[PDB]
Amino acid sequence: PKPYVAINMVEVRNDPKTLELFGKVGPKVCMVTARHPGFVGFQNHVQIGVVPLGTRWGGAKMEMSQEMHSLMLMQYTFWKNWKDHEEMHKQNWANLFRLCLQCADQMIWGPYEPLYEIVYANMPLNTEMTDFTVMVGKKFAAGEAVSIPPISQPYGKRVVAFGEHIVKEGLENQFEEYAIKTLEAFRSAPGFLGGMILKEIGVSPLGSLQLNAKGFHQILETANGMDVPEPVTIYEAPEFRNRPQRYIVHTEWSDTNALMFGLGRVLIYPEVRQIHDKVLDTLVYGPYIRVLNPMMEGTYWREYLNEYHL
Amino acid sequence: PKPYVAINMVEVRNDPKTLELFGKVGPKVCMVTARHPGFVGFQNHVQIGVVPLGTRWGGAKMEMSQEMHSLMLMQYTFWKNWKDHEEMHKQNWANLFRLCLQCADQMIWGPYEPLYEIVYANMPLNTEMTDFTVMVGKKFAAGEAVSIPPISQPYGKRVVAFGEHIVKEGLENQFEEYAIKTLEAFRSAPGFLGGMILKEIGVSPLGSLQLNAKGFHQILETANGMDVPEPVTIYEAPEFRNRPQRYIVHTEWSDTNALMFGLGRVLIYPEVRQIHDKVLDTLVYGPYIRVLNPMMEGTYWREYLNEYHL
Amino acid sequence: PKPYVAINMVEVRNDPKTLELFGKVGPKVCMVTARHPGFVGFQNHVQIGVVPLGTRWGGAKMEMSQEMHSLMLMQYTFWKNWKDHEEMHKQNWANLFRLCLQCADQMIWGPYEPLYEIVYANMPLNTEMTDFTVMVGKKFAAGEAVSIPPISQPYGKRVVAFGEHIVKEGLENQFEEYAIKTLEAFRSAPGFLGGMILKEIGVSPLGSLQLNAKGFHQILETANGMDVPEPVTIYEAPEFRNRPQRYIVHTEWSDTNALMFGLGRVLIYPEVRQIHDKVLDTLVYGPYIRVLNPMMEGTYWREYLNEYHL
Amino acid sequence: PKPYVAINMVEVRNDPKTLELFGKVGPKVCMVTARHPGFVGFQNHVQIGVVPLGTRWGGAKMEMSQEMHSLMLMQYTFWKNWKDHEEMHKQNWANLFRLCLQCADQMIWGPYEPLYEIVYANMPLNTEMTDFTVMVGKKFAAGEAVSIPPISQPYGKRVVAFGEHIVKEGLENQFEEYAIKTLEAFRSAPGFLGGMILKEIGVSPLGSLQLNAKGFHQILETANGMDVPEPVTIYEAPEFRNRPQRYIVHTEWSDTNALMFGLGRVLIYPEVRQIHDKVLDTLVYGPYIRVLNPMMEGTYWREYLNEYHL
Ligand SMILES: [Fe+3]
Ligand SMILES: [Fe+3]
Ligand SMILES: [Fe+3]
Ligand SMILES: [Fe+3]
């Protein structure tokens, strides 16, 4: 079934010290998160660029990463129920807070952790190029040759388009209908690996290090987290539901050229342009498309979604 | 009286080509804006850093600017009525659109242009060090020695703290009361040059290049703006009023040390810490404090605010 | 009272030999000029740049001086009566001519020496930063706190805007009225140090090395001025009064940023733009604004103007 | 009213790692200290040199800092009652101990934290150069033109003379009388910014990491303070009151030349030399004068002392 998604957003220094530190701390955070039986996996991204749409963001490129002093991270965790994420943070607050503060000397902004429901998902199981023989054999044996997925390679071997959209009050149904029809049209595009539409439903206070005044002071005063703030918040996640309605349109692509020309169908393929025009007519903000590299992931989140495995 | 504020937010390449281009285009945009009789001046900023609050954002510094591949700009325009800003953009769309696109090859994100009401302002006239004799003489002649302002030097010779806050629904009155009391306490801090509290009331669609589908395509297709999009929007500014309520707490300081230790009173001076704790107990997001350099400005916005001049 | 002004204009090589030579000869010319009891002081300038007004003169900058192979000098002398200047040149012709020819191997153009009446002056006494205590004390003791001037620092520690204007026949009264109202509006601008409006009334033949044919040959033939031309002219200064009417709008500023944003009020502050539009509607030429550095000066010309001293 | 003073004394490596670490840890220690309502502010110093008094310490200079492998820090905290300091250390022992040990790899000697009563204080509010207009205006409006203080700039923009004195038993009253008369004479010296006389009344055991045997072992054995020693001491602060009586004569100066020639009045101005000779006749040790730079400070301690603010 469809999980719920938490996206931990942080901006960190683009330094070898930061790469090394996150490679040591990130796995520990995933191990703590996996103490909760509602956790069904994760997908961690580094922003590598921006889709320029001709010259609209002419200072940007799809691969800018080398040039940048900081990195935006978008760390997705997947949950059977969105309250499972909030419960996991409360139950594991001390260990999580301490791991979060190991990243302290590297952080510029965040963490900020919006929570999402999935409106639509066409997200296949990941497979390595070594695995396609197994996937083809098992799909043929089940009489499902017609629904064999593309090869969506894990661990940094494909790219993500992270499309930010904010929708005028009352046009949410129109946005969802025509964003789904757009993602269905992308199934024709070479190197399309799937997509999903995320609808923001709140912001995690503990995931965002947002406490009451006493907690805020304890966060600032702690010697590397040894001194644990009391995790008392002034809100619960649904009380920070941004309006107007935020969506992320998340698509996955073999590489940045497939992304550019595949997403480009909304501009250059008249029949797809007509569908996506209905999406554009709902927006107060966007589209703004970040290019992400999905580096570290727990691909079993898609086994939960699709209710099968290889 | 209190003007309304539009803050044009953009992220641009940190290049000599971008510095030169903005120094040529920026003044022209100000001249077009000044065609509207509701325009009362402007204050343009470049973000130079982040207040780290000890190690909370330990990868940031108050002066990071040299290290960065891109710059955030926050370009304030001041208006007798917020609708004057919307009318100016509509009446001058072609010339503004074309100037905005000269910056095209330098832009990474934006423009995004929220509109604000001023809740509170203690913002003196700017003066050069050469002017303090005039300011002192005129104040003494009026028997107003008690209200002589500090010397708030224009054109890059002071710094700004840009404090982002998002307030839980129903706690806006509490936030405003205690944010005002905090800014009043800052009058005791060495190098405090004034502050104001901005309350977000909408987002300018034309200022944010947010049009209907037809307009969006014309923006992407134009050869440097010669081809002018039809400025038809799917919303007006009040239909993009973010909830929960956004505020900017804008303070001005002689230098970054005065900023750090002056703002720091909310953490290290017990009587001020007790005031600001009431602000902290209202927040769903923040505080997050950007350090800005106010470079190009039309200081006469403060003549409008304070209803006098030297 | 208002003196009359002679502005000796020359273009010289931008060389260390030229800087050294002018530093030795300039003071001697001032000492010769001071033989005449009508001489009330001087203010010598080097042009350092041009106000570009956005991209209108996009090859220019306010500080270009380093990049230039030649320098324009504008050497102001101040006189109780304009005929005093002409009498001084006639009475001191040999010594002045010989000092002028010491600069010979450095001159590219000039000298050209227009004469001016002052239409309007708001030009304070100069003071060093060490003097402001005296200036404040003396003004307070006189009950004149309201009219304390800004600190207008002498000897290269401020900048000058030299605004060239040529006015259509019959629109001189309109030009003068609204140029005065513009300079009055500049009193509100940070770092404004005063201004004056100069109206060209003739050209000095002896100051311009303009003699009859016999004199011209003696100028060309002289061995460094030992051989003195007979100072016979074919005109007197009022017979070279340019039409249409030339004006210089001379303003003084703390620094080039204060100059750019202060003069900029005629473009970006709607109420001042409306005043200065009446000036623009009188022009056949201009505005063209040179940026000058007032290096060597006899500040006592302002003691004569203002009829007081510290 | 007069606060009491704790001076935390440590010697640390003069390394970029030590500068960075103290810039991150110091603010956190101040925030923990500010949990106690008796805390009224702080003034942290780095020793930059020694007053050589001709050739008496001829190997020393007033600015030696660049040449040195280690730095002496003198971190002043100010308290309504000296017991407030002892209570703050006891109540916040775990968080303070952990922050103190983050500095561990940089420490050579200390911490050693004597406690003081203020015998005499002439210590103005600090002001930035931007603030002097406000300070002058508010003092004139209060009828206190006669008592306007000098501009004592915060955050590393002045220097401190830290004068060590030890007084023969029975000569304390003579020392205090003539040390006060000496500091009154310094009001005549250019660049004098105030002074105070501190009389040592004890040593903080917790501030000095002086515990019983069990605590000492736990201090040595702790993994970076995670393992918290039991804060059991063998003495209270008044049981480590050094005899004979220690004083610090603390004076503040615009710069090191004003310090040298201003303090020098006790040697070179006969009438002041006669006053200070009465101080010299009381000493068993001293004077020994360290030159300090007051870098990070909570200037509101002077608002408590003087019972007003700007
Ligand atoms: Fe989370
Ligand atoms: Fe705008
Ligand atoms: Fe002349
Ligand atoms: Fe202590």
PDB file of N, CA and C in Angstrom, chain A residues 129-190:
ATOM      1  N   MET A 129      21.594  -3.613 -12.719  1.00  0.00           N
ATOM      2  CA  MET A 129      21.740  -4.224 -14.053  1.00  0.00           C
ATOM      3  C   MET A 129      21.978  -5.740 -13.936  1.00  0.00           C
ATOM      4  N   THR A 130      22.470  -6.281 -12.835  1.00  0.00           N
ATOM      5  CA  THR A 130      22.677  -7.717 -12.638  1.00  0.00           C
ATOM      6  C   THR A 130      21.337  -8.444 -12.446  1.00  0.00           C
ATOM      7  N   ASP A 131      20.297  -7.721 -12.077  1.00  0.00           N
ATOM      8  CA  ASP A 131      19.033  -8.328 -11.581  1.00  0.00           C
ATOM      9  C   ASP A 131      17.990  -8.431 -12.706  1.00  0.00           C
ATOM     10  N   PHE A 132      18.202  -7.847 -13.871  1.00  0.00           N
ATOM     11  CA  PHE A 132      17.054  -7.705 -14.819  1.00  0.00           C
ATOM     12  C   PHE A 132      16.616  -9.097 -15.321  1.00  0.00           C
ATOM     13  N   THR A 133      17.519 -10.058 -15.362  1.00  0.00           N
ATOM     14  CA  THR A 133      17.238 -11.448 -15.793  1.00  0.00           C
ATOM     15  C   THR A 133      16.203 -12.056 -14.844  1.00  0.00           C
ATOM     16  N   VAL A 134      16.385 -11.892 -13.531  1.00  0.00           N
ATOM     17  CA  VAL A 134      15.458 -12.379 -12.486  1.00  0.00           C
ATOM     18  C   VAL A 134      14.096 -11.714 -12.696  1.00  0.00           C
ATOM     19  N   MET A 135      14.077 -10.387 -12.832  1.00  0.00           N
ATOM     20  CA  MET A 135      12.825  -9.602 -12.934  1.00  0.00           C
ATOM     21  C   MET A 135      12.074 -10.035 -14.189  1.00  0.00           C
ATOM     22  N   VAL A 136      12.748 -10.172 -15.329  1.00  0.00           N
ATOM     23  CA  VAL A 136      12.101 -10.582 -16.609  1.00  0.00           C
ATOM     24  C   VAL A 136      11.542 -12.007 -16.445  1.00  0.00           C
ATOM     25  N   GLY A 137      12.334 -12.932 -15.926  1.00  0.00           N
ATOM     26  CA  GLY A 137      11.897 -14.332 -15.742  1.00  0.00           C
ATOM     27  C   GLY A 137      10.657 -14.413 -14.847  1.00  0.00           C
ATOM     28  N   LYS A 138      10.679 -13.738 -13.709  1.00  0.00           N
ATOM     29  CA  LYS A 138       9.570 -13.814 -12.731  1.00  0.00           C
ATOM     30  C   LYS A 138       8.306 -13.154 -13.314  1.00  0.00           C
ATOM     31  N   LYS A 139       8.435 -12.046 -14.033  1.00  0.00           N
ATOM     32  CA  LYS A 139       7.260 -11.371 -14.624  1.00  0.00           C
ATOM     33  C   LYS A 139       6.691 -12.231 -15.755  1.00  0.00           C
ATOM     34  N   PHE A 140       7.542 -12.802 -16.605  1.00  0.00           N
ATOM     35  CA  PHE A 140       7.035 -13.706 -17.658  1.00  0.00           C
ATOM     36  C   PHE A 140       6.312 -14.903 -17.012  1.00  0.00           C
ATOM     37  N   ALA A 141       6.899 -15.497 -15.985  1.00  0.00           N
ATOM     38  CA  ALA A 141       6.321 -16.728 -15.368  1.00  0.00           C
ATOM     39  C   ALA A 141       4.948 -16.409 -14.764  1.00  0.00           C
ATOM     40  N   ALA A 142       4.707 -15.179 -14.308  1.00  0.00           N
ATOM     41  CA  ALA A 142       3.431 -14.775 -13.682  1.00  0.00           C
ATOM     42  C   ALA A 142       2.389 -14.368 -14.753  1.00  0.00           C
ATOM     43  N   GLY A 143       2.719 -14.437 -16.031  1.00  0.00           N
ATOM     44  CA  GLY A 143       1.875 -13.947 -17.129  1.00  0.00           C
ATOM     45  C   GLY A 143       1.788 -12.426 -17.155  1.00  0.00           C
ATOM     46  N   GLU A 144       2.832 -11.734 -16.690  1.00  0.00           N
ATOM     47  CA  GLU A 144       2.795 -10.261 -16.553  1.00  0.00           C
ATOM     48  C   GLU A 144       3.888  -9.634 -17.427  1.00  0.00           C
ATOM     49  N   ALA A 145       4.192 -10.204 -18.586  1.00  0.00           N
ATOM     50  CA  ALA A 145       5.136  -9.580 -19.541  1.00  0.00           C
ATOM     51  C   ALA A 145       4.715  -8.133 -19.820  1.00  0.00           C
ATOM     52  N   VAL A 146       3.421  -7.832 -19.866  1.00  0.00           N
ATOM     53  CA  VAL A 146       2.953  -6.487 -20.284  1.00  0.00           C
ATOM     54  C   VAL A 146       3.357  -5.423 -19.242  1.00  0.00           C
ATOM     55  N   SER A 147       3.652  -5.806 -18.014  1.00  0.00           N
ATOM     56  CA  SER A 147       3.861  -4.839 -16.909  1.00  0.00           C
ATOM     57  C   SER A 147       5.291  -4.951 -16.360  1.00  0.00           C
ATOM     58  N   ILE A 148       6.233  -5.448 -17.160  1.00  0.00           N
ATOM     59  CA  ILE A 148       7.646  -5.518 -16.694  1.00  0.00           C
ATOM     60  C   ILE A 148       8.123  -4.068 -16.544  1.00  0.00           C
ATOM     61  N   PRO A 149       8.708  -3.708 -15.394  1.00  0.00           N
ATOM     62  CA  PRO A 149       9.204  -2.338 -15.219  1.00  0.00           C
ATOM     63  C   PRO A 149      10.526  -2.084 -15.914  1.00  0.00           C
ATOM     64  N   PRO A 150      10.869  -0.785 -16.081  1.00  0.00           N
ATOM     65  CA  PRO A 150      12.220  -0.406 -16.494  1.00  0.00           C
ATOM     66  C   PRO A 150      13.201  -0.762 -15.371  1.00  0.00           C
ATOM     67  N   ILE A 151      14.490  -0.699 -15.709  1.00  0.00           N
ATOM     68  CA  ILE A 151      15.607  -0.977 -14.772  1.00  0.00           C
ATOM     69  C   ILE A 151      15.919   0.357 -14.089  1.00  0.00           C
ATOM     70  N   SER A 152      15.476   0.498 -12.860  1.00  0.00           N
ATOM     71  CA  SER A 152      15.651   1.691 -12.010  1.00  0.00           C
ATOM     72  C   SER A 152      16.775   1.391 -11.022  1.00  0.00           C
ATOM     73  N   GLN A 153      18.006   1.796 -11.353  1.00  0.00           N
ATOM     74  CA  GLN A 153      19.189   1.328 -10.602  1.00  0.00           C
ATOM     75  C   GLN A 153      19.307   2.123  -9.306  1.00  0.00           C
ATOM     76  N   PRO A 154      19.604   1.432  -8.194  1.00  0.00           N
ATOM     77  CA  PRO A 154      19.751   2.063  -6.904  1.00  0.00           C
ATOM     78  C   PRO A 154      21.144   2.696  -6.688  1.00  0.00           C
ATOM     79  N   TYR A 155      21.243   3.435  -5.603  1.00  0.00           N
ATOM     80  CA  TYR A 155      22.531   3.862  -4.974  1.00  0.00           C
ATOM     81  C   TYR A 155      23.303   4.774  -5.943  1.00  0.00           C
ATOM     82  N   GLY A 156      22.675   5.879  -6.341  1.00  0.00           N
ATOM     83  CA  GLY A 156      23.344   6.940  -7.103  1.00  0.00           C
ATOM     84  C   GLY A 156      23.406   6.683  -8.598  1.00  0.00           C
ATOM     85  N   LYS A 157      22.694   5.671  -9.131  1.00  0.00           N
ATOM     86  CA  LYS A 157      22.806   5.310 -10.563  1.00  0.00           C
ATOM     87  C   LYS A 157      21.573   5.746 -11.354  1.00  0.00           C
ATOM     88  N   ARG A 158      20.838   6.741 -10.880  1.00  0.00           N
ATOM     89  CA  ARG A 158      19.782   7.422 -11.652  1.00  0.00           C
ATOM     90  C   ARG A 158      19.609   8.808 -11.057  1.00  0.00           C
ATOM     91  N   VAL A 159      18.712   9.611 -11.605  1.00  0.00           N
ATOM     92  CA  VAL A 159      18.476  10.975 -11.105  1.00  0.00           C
ATOM     93  C   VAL A 159      17.001  11.198 -10.827  1.00  0.00           C
ATOM     94  N   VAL A 160      16.750  12.205 -10.029  1.00  0.00           N
ATOM     95  CA  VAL A 160      15.407  12.591  -9.543  1.00  0.00           C
ATOM     96  C   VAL A 160      15.138  14.032  -9.913  1.00  0.00           C
ATOM     97  N   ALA A 161      13.939  14.307 -10.413  1.00  0.00           N
ATOM     98  CA  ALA A 161      13.398  15.659 -10.575  1.00  0.00           C
ATOM     99  C   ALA A 161      12.432  15.902  -9.422  1.00  0.00           C
ATOM    100  N   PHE A 162      12.704  16.954  -8.666  1.00  0.00           N
ATOM    101  CA  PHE A 162      11.950  17.337  -7.458  1.00  0.00           C
ATOM    102  C   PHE A 162      11.214  18.611  -7.784  1.00  0.00           C
ATOM    103  N   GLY A 163       9.937  18.471  -8.178  1.00  0.00           N
ATOM    104  CA  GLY A 163       9.183  19.595  -8.752  1.00  0.00           C
ATOM    105  C   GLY A 163       8.292  20.239  -7.713  1.00  0.00           C
ATOM    106  N   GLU A 164       8.629  21.454  -7.327  1.00  0.00           N
ATOM    107  CA  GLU A 164       7.902  22.205  -6.266  1.00  0.00           C
ATOM    108  C   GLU A 164       6.728  22.922  -6.887  1.00  0.00           C
ATOM    109  N   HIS A 165       5.562  22.750  -6.261  1.00  0.00           N
ATOM    110  CA  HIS A 165       4.292  23.345  -6.737  1.00  0.00           C
ATOM    111  C   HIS A 165       3.497  23.803  -5.516  1.00  0.00           C
ATOM    112  N   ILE A 166       2.900  24.981  -5.608  1.00  0.00           N
ATOM    113  CA  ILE A 166       1.934  25.454  -4.589  1.00  0.00           C
ATOM    114  C   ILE A 166       0.668  25.828  -5.363  1.00  0.00           C
ATOM    115  N   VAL A 167      -0.463  25.315  -4.879  1.00  0.00           N
ATOM    116  CA  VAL A 167      -1.740  25.304  -5.640  1.00  0.00           C
ATOM    117  C   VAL A 167      -2.757  26.242  -4.978  1.00  0.00           C
ATOM    118  N   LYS A 168      -3.404  27.046  -5.791  1.00  0.00           N
ATOM    119  CA  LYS A 168      -4.462  27.984  -5.347  1.00  0.00           C
ATOM    120  C   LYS A 168      -5.555  27.207  -4.605  1.00  0.00           C
ATOM    121  N   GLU A 169      -6.069  27.787  -3.523  1.00  0.00           N
ATOM    122  CA  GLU A 169      -7.166  27.167  -2.753  1.00  0.00           C
ATOM    123  C   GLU A 169      -8.316  26.873  -3.717  1.00  0.00           C
ATOM    124  N   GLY A 170      -8.833  25.656  -3.664  1.00  0.00           N
ATOM    125  CA  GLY A 170      -9.961  25.197  -4.493  1.00  0.00           C
ATOM    126  C   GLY A 170      -9.519  24.557  -5.786  1.00  0.00           C
ATOM    127  N   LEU A 171      -8.214  24.621  -6.174  1.00  0.00           N
ATOM    128  CA  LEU A 171      -7.792  24.014  -7.461  1.00  0.00           C
ATOM    129  C   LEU A 171      -6.975  22.744  -7.211  1.00  0.00           C
ATOM    130  N   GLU A 172      -7.003  22.198  -5.999  1.00  0.00           N
ATOM    131  CA  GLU A 172      -6.257  20.971  -5.643  1.00  0.00           C
ATOM    132  C   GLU A 172      -6.728  19.789  -6.490  1.00  0.00           C
ATOM    133  N   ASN A 173      -8.040  19.584  -6.650  1.00  0.00           N
ATOM    134  CA  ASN A 173      -8.545  18.433  -7.440  1.00  0.00           C
ATOM    135  C   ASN A 173      -8.079  18.537  -8.890  1.00  0.00           C
ATOM    136  N   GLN A 174      -8.116  19.724  -9.472  1.00  0.00           N
ATOM    137  CA  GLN A 174      -7.690  19.972 -10.864  1.00  0.00           C
ATOM    138  C   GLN A 174      -6.185  19.680 -10.958  1.00  0.00           C
ATOM    139  N   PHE A 175      -5.404  20.223 -10.025  1.00  0.00           N
ATOM    140  CA  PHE A 175      -3.933  19.960 -10.008  1.00  0.00           C
ATOM    141  C   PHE A 175      -3.679  18.452  -9.994  1.00  0.00           C
ATOM    142  N   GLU A 176      -4.292  17.724  -9.058  1.00  0.00           N
ATOM    143  CA  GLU A 176      -4.022  16.293  -8.884  1.00  0.00           C
ATOM    144  C   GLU A 176      -4.414  15.543 -10.154  1.00  0.00           C
ATOM    145  N   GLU A 177      -5.579  15.835 -10.730  1.00  0.00           N
ATOM    146  CA  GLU A 177      -6.046  15.068 -11.911  1.00  0.00           C
ATOM    147  C   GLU A 177      -5.032  15.208 -13.049  1.00  0.00           C
ATOM    148  N   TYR A 178      -4.586  16.439 -13.324  1.00  0.00           N
ATOM    149  CA  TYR A 178      -3.760  16.725 -14.515  1.00  0.00           C
ATOM    150  C   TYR A 178      -2.274  16.476 -14.205  1.00  0.00           C
ATOM    151  N   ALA A 179      -1.845  16.539 -12.945  1.00  0.00           N
ATOM    152  CA  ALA A 179      -0.459  16.114 -12.598  1.00  0.00           C
ATOM    153  C   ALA A 179      -0.356  14.600 -12.786  1.00  0.00           C
ATOM    154  N   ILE A 180      -1.408  13.846 -12.414  1.00  0.00           N
ATOM    155  CA  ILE A 180      -1.423  12.379 -12.644  1.00  0.00           C
ATOM    156  C   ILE A 180      -1.376  12.115 -14.150  1.00  0.00           C
ATOM    157  N   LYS A 181      -2.185  12.821 -14.936  1.00  0.00           N
ATOM    158  CA  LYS A 181      -2.210  12.591 -16.390  1.00  0.00           C
ATOM    159  C   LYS A 181      -0.848  12.936 -17.017  1.00  0.00           C
ATOM    160  N   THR A 182      -0.176  13.933 -16.470  1.00  0.00           N
ATOM    161  CA  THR A 182       1.194  14.293 -16.931  1.00  0.00           C
ATOM    162  C   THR A 182       2.144  13.155 -16.644  1.00  0.00           C
ATOM    163  N   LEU A 183       2.168  12.646 -15.422  1.00  0.00           N
ATOM    164  CA  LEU A 183       3.069  11.528 -15.050  1.00  0.00           C
ATOM    165  C   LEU A 183       2.722  10.285 -15.872  1.00  0.00           C
ATOM    166  N   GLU A 184       1.442  10.061 -16.180  1.00  0.00           N
ATOM    167  CA  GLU A 184       1.102   8.929 -17.074  1.00  0.00           C
ATOM    168  C   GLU A 184       1.713   9.141 -18.470  1.00  0.00           C
ATOM    169  N   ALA A 185       1.681  10.356 -19.000  1.00  0.00           N
ATOM    170  CA  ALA A 185       2.277  10.671 -20.314  1.00  0.00           C
ATOM    171  C   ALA A 185       3.796  10.418 -20.265  1.00  0.00           C
ATOM    172  N   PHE A 186       4.440  10.603 -19.099  1.00  0.00           N
ATOM    173  CA  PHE A 186       5.913  10.402 -18.999  1.00  0.00           C
ATOM    174  C   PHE A 186       6.298   8.946 -19.191  1.00  0.00           C
ATOM    175  N   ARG A 187       5.360   7.997 -19.058  1.00  0.00           N
ATOM    176  CA  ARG A 187       5.653   6.579 -19.318  1.00  0.00           C
ATOM    177  C   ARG A 187       6.111   6.350 -20.761  1.00  0.00           C
ATOM    178  N   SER A 188       5.822   7.251 -21.692  1.00  0.00           N
ATOM    179  CA  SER A 188       6.253   7.169 -23.109  1.00  0.00           C
ATOM    180  C   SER A 188       7.688   7.681 -23.299  1.00  0.00           C
ATOM    181  N   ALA A 189       8.229   8.391 -22.315  1.00  0.00           N
ATOM    182  CA  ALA A 189       9.515   9.117 -22.486  1.00  0.00           C
ATOM    183  C   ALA A 189      10.670   8.169 -22.221  1.00  0.00           C
ATOM    184  N   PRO A 190      11.675   8.137 -23.107  1.00  0.00           N
ATOM    185  CA  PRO A 190      12.856   7.326 -22.866  1.00  0.00           C
ATOM    186  C   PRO A 190      13.515   7.678 -21.523  1.00  0.00           C
TER     187      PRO A 190
END
